[PDB]
Amino acid sequence: AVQKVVVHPLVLLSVVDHFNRIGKVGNQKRVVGVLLGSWQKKVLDVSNSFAVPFDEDDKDDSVWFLDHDYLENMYGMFKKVNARERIVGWYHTGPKLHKNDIAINELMKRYCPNSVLVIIDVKPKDLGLPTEAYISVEEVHDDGTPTSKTFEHVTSEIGAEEAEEVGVEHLLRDIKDTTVGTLSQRITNQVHGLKGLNSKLLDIRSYLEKVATGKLPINHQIIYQLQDVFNLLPDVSLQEFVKAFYLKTNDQMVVVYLASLIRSVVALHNLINNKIANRDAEKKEG
Template sequence: MLPTTNPITISQNTTVIVHPLVLLSVVDHYNRVAKSTKKRVLGVLLGQNNSKTVNVANSFAVPFEEDERDPSVWFLDHNYVEAMNDMFKKVNAREKMIGWYHSGPKLRGSDLEINELFKRYTPNPVLVIVDVEPKDIGIPTDAYFAIEEIKDDGTATTKTFMHVPSQIDAEESEEIGVEHLLRDIKDNAVGTLSTRVTDQLNSLKGLQSRLEEIREYLQKVVDRQLPINHQIIYNLQDIFNLLPNLNVSDTVKSFSVKTNDQLLVKVYNQLKKKRKKKIKLKRKTQKKVQRLRKEKNKVVS
């Protein structure tokens, strides 16, 4: 059995940082094992955990089977987990086992039992669910920690998962590697106009959905359906404070100058196209006149 580390306090302020290498590994694992099926894949997460920030830097796949009809029936090869973890420690001792992942896309009934198994290796394992086929725009990860839920009526506590914020971050070397991989797939810099417009439209749809979630939350707070969470209110206030004041004269002038510059380029291009058409029509007319003159001279002679 692997040695466990000292317990670390986990709170809702804890942030889970997932590196692109982990996302690529999970997607590759899913495509190799469970693509076009309803099965999920499962693996181990490696990195560092200092209670405030959980840095998920690496991962490896684990053989896993479960009964889709009975969530309580599942198999995970813990001997394989221990052997792989020993080999990874020889390569990078800084990367410790900090939790596990699966392809979800949502929590399953057996997740708490599997999480208890990983407590043999780390006291507070983080569960990261990676949506390998996302239908919505946004971050494809959800992070959870198992906690003891205390009941108000004094009954026995129950275990449940607490959601914590997650984000995607990368070191400089990872960014270079990801850019190199994506270069052969899609180059956004030289994409067609329709592709760029579609990307901007999808980004705006994502922004609209986030704003709608904020509006619904605030409305529930006003209607007393949810208690006031001052931390969330402070975060929202910080977000709105970052919005530019569009009524400032300098900002209005900057927008006007930028718009005029863009319109000038557009007008110039239109004039250029019309000039080319005019020159083309003139040349065509001249050729037609010359041809008629030659035919006339032949008739006269």
């Protein structure tokens, strides 16, 4: 169904406001709400949101409260001031999946047959991206295990509108940025790449401990996937691949040589202009 989802900044600021406000009604560690949006050509666009009361008794699953006829009432009250937008899905601000949210989803799906989940973690502890997108599917099994009802991943991004990025930029007076050109490349696409890749490999590293009797091998599936990973990775950089590499490095650098030469000649020319102009005018004004 859905191929990608796009989020506008107004939603993210709304989430954060809700998270800070709840302290006046409870003590819970999570909050839940509704996403208003629209979509076309399997590209989904979320634009606006409001938050509805929710509560959960932490020490168990299966004991939670979610207020229907407040949701229906608000949806009515909003529709009266913008006809463009319709229920699309829901969000919660927990850092990690919870046991019961599939059972939340099977409720709120009665308001929209395609409903999508967005996790918006409000306290990042890393370099990263603040949103994740999930859709619900049924899984068969080869083990003869009964059919399982389970989430599936969807790629996500932030989008923008000209009427908002004016505000975002008026507000982004906080720190440095835009170390132009060659300065920004290597930071943005080498260092902050390698840090991510490292964190991922540490995560796999940790999981393969628990299998030391701490937990049951979750499936041979995950092991088959790992074997694909270590099989695919590029062949040892030892064959005539090396020849093909040197060729392009020569060609890549030669034109650099040319450009650098151009770069120097202009400096000499500017030098001469500065020199003559100086001395002449000096003797003249003397």
